């Protein structure tokens, strides 16, 4: 029942705060830091750090942290996309005052005890092996390493050999540096805004300007095919796409939403996907054909994502790209264009609506654009997108160099070009 008091500070730190009648008092302190900032020399300082969120602080014993969470009933969680790590804490309105200090104290200067670090090097193995339990995942950290030179090719997680060789010192590096007070941006909610500046300043004084933040990382055409025993290879084909926040990126959005972001009919069907109708007519059912598009602030990666049988994955990926060409022919009914625009609006409304998606959204624009905004303006610019500009984006994906990845059986999954 309000709009937030958007912020800038002389040391720089956004502290947006949507005061509400909502019981779920929450804050989501953010960091612009992520896997991209590291090079080949120190993979995975990131993931061990996200697990290092559990470590003791100068301000508190790890015992006192974990106890300090569970006792109040509140809790914590750590989002960490390549473009941003995202600490988060949730609780009751009269109970935020202490817990907020914890994450502050968490984000302050916890000591990186060597035994504790090697101890979490245990955690790294499990957490990585289970994170990649998904066949889809097997493609994605892979795929980013497929189409990129460095930063965005960085894994979110350290490779297992690196794990023991991951060191507390690298943590000291990435924390002393990339965790800039400027790059960071707190996002309060149920708490009133003005008090949020108060306690935040206990920490907001910490840390000097910026960090390395180099290595933009740029596209490469490189194929990657891990080969596993799975019956269902999940082939994916990607040309680089414009990103992000550009109107052309919006064109990529309209384009993939022509395919659809995902099914809208559980235990049903999805005919409004264009490519899926393009393939299923030509291929037996056990497969999926769907939209995909990376949208990093530095670069994007549009492409087909195609769950498929190893027996005939090629028919699927080809028929799918054939349909993409059909949009790239200039061959486009305008009906599903506006329907796709409606999908843009709908999906954006849901992704905004939930408090998690709300806050992650608010930070996601505030961390980069720096501009808090009501969704409706976004609806206006997104309905502003040109119908033919879709043909434009299709022409680009057909145009750009095509990195491809498809970990799996790799029986009949032909390389891009040859």
């Amino acid at each position: 029942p309000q709009d937030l008091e958007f912020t800038r500070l002389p040391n720089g730190l956004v502290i947006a705060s949507l005061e509400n009648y909502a019981p779920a008092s929450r804050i989501g302190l953010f960091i612009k830091a992520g896997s991209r900032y590291e090079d080949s020399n120190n993979l995975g300082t990131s993931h061990l750090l996200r697990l290092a969120s559990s470590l003791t602080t100068k301000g508190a014993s790890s015992f006192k942290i974990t106890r300090g969470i569970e006792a109040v009933g509140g809790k914590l969680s750590v989002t960490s996309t390549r473009e941003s790590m995202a600490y988060t804490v949730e609780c009751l309105r009269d109970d935020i005052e202490i817990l907020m200090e914890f994450l502050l104290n968490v984000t302050a200067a916890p000591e990186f005890r060597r035994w504790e670090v090697a101890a979490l090097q245990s955690q790294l193995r499990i957490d990585k092996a289970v994170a990649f339990q998904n066949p889809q995942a097997q493609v994605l950290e892979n795929l980013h390493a497929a189409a990129y030179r460095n930063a965005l090719a960085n894994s979110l997680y350290c490779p297992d050999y690196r794990i023991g060789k991951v060191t507390p010192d690298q943590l000291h590096y990435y924390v002393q540096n990339h965790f800039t007070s400027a790059r960071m941006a707190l996002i309060g909610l149920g708490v009133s805004h003005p008090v949020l500046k108060q306690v935040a300043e206990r920490f907001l004084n910490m840390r000097g300007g910026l960090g390395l933040s180099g290595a933009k990382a740029k596209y490469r055409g490189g194929e990657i095919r891990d080969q596993n025993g799975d019956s269902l290879v999940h082939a994916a084909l990607v040309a680089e796409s414009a990103a992000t926040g550009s109107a052309e990126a919006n064109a990529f959005s309209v384009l993939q939403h022509v395919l659809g972001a995902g099914p809208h009919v559980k235990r049903g069907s999805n005919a409004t996907s264009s490519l899926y109708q393009a393939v299923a007519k030509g291929v037996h059912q056990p497969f999926d054909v769907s939209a995909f598009n990376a949208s990093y602030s530095d670069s994007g990666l549009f492409g087909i994502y195609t769950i498929s049988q190893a027996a005939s994955a090629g028919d699927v990926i080809k028929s799918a790209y054939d349909q993409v060409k059909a949009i790239a022919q200039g061959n486009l009914s305008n009906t599903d264009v506006q329907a796709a625009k409606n999908k843009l609006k709908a999906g954006y409304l849901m992704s905004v609506e939930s408090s998690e998606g709300f806050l992650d959204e608010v930070g996601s624009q505030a961390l980069v654009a720096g501009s808090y905004m009501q969704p409706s303006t976004v609806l206006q610019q997104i309905d502003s997108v040109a119908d033919a500009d879709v043909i434009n984006a299709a022409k680009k994906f057909v145009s750009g160099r095509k990195s491809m990845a498809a970990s799996g059986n790799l029986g009949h999954t032909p390389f891009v070009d040859e």
Partner: protein, 446 residues
């Protein structure tokens, strides 16, 4: 400024109107631009007898696949057009058809529900899609673990009870049922007041009611031929269930003692116990040597892969219980501690632990109640339960209501000397035989 009282009173209440055919309408005015229309039909798996054991799942799998009004591909293309996220599921007892959607499409959405529930067309080829899909899907469900464990738990804890059988039902029953009997299922169950219309959001209540009036007024209320279902206060067997399967990488287990019904005053303090036991999982940095005591030792000696306390409650009866994944050599060990936890809740339950569990509980409520769909569901189930939306001020008055004395009493009345119903899917071998398991329900010291 912010305070707990605002958390108390910022929430608007639903109205409870009713149609001529007894369908009731409720929807909190959330002032939400997006809205989730909902109809949580009260029909469910426990109701059907063995002849039509899976019928609800069948209709669950063919609502939109063919409706009498329009071809199913037309309705499909429609929902694909509207951009609304249609959805539906079915518990053992609460079949649910609800459409996440935009407020702008609302009259279209509700009439679309009328197109769904009130009528369905059944192509025999479409029915063939139903059958071949599900028959190919059974084997996939066998591949899953957790469901199969709880499937044994319901299949064994109740046995001869109607509630005991699988929701999807028998592999053979599904490859048999007539289209006509399915229509019979629809025509005996899908009628008001089993349906309960709901859609929290920016939807205007009066418009919702008036909109309901144009469609669901047609809907039947009188039961056919005076045929009338009646129910049982079903017995709870304590029989243990021990499936093994050595080839499976890990033992996978769930224990469950009998619980209070889905309308029982003691359920709230019992919920506190779920927090008090404190569920665990492998990923956490929150375990290590901390967390809850069983979670603590599981994190300390690498006992549990994971375990989850749970408190399912059917309208007659509930199932207090726990569920751990486990390595073969520590099977007994988690158990060795687990039952103690129950006894730990019996004698010497510290109030500090009590408030810990209460706080985690309150957080569980508020965490559940974020979003449109979850609360549309809350409206859509609370009415089937107590009736009422059962307001949070009441829930939290009822959480403040709990005391350690009452905790020890209820725990005494369920944990302290009561016959376990245990189910396992492993391999299990370290796991103690029933008496030994039964041995742990009572401390020899008390």
């Amino acid at each position: 400024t912010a305070t707990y009282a605002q958390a108390l009173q910022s929430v608007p209440e639903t109205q409870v109107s009713q149609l001529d055919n007894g369908l009731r309408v409720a929807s909190e005015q959330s002032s939400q631009p997006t809205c989730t229309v909902g109809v949580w039909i009260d029909a469910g798996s426990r109701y059907e007898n063995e002849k039509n054991n899976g019928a609800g799942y069948f209709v669950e799998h063919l609502a939109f696949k063919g409706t009498k009004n329009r071809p199913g591909s037309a309705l499909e293309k429609e929902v694909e057009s509207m951009g609304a996220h249609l959805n539906a599921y079915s518990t053992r007892e609460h079949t649910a058809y609800y459409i996440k959607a935009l407020s702008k499409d609302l009259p279209k959405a509700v009439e679309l529900l009328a197109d769904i529930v009130q009528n369905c067309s059944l192509e025999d080829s479409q029915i063939e899609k139903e059958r071949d899909v599900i028959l190919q899907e059974l084997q996939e469900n066998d591949s899953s673990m957790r469901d199969v464990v709880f499937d044994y738990l319901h299949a064994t804890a109740f046995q001869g009870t109607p509630l005991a059988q699988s929701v999807e039902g028998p592999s053979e029953n599904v490859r048999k049922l007539s289209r006509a009997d399915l229509t019979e299922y629809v025509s005996q169950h899908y009628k008001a007041p089993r349906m309960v219309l709901a859609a929290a959001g920016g939807v205007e209540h009066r418009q919702l009611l008036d909109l309901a009036q144009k469609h669901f007024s047609s809907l039947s209320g009188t039961y056919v031929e005076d045929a009338v279902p009646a129910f049982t206060p079903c017995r709870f067997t304590g029989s243990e269930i021990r499936h093994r399967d050595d080839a499976l990488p890990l033992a996978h287990v769930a224990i469950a003692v009998e619980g209070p019904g889905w309308a029982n005053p003691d359920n709230v303090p019992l919920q506190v116990a779920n927090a008090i036991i404190g569920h665990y999982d492998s990923t956490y940095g929150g375990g290590t040597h901390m967390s809850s005591t069983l979670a603590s030792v599981a994190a300390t000696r690498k006992l549990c892969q994971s375990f989850q306390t749970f408190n399912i409650c059917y309208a007659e009866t509930g199932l207090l219980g726990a569920h751990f994944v486990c390595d073969n050599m520590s099977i007994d060990d988690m158990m060795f501690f687990l039952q103690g936890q129950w006894m730990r809740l019996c004698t010497s339950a510290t109030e500090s632990e009590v408030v810990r569990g209460k706080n985690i509980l309150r957080n569980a409520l508020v965490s559940h109640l974020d979003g449109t769909t979850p609360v549309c569901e809350d409206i859509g189930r609370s009415l089937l339960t107590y009736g009422r939306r059962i307001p949070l001020a009441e829930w939290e008055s009822r959480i403040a209501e709990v005391d350690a004395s009452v905790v020890r009493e209820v725990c005494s009345k369920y944990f302290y000397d009561q016959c376990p119903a245990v189910a396992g899917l492993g391999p299990i071998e370290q796991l103690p035989d029933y008496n030994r398991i039964r041995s742990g329900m009572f401390w020899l010291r008390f």
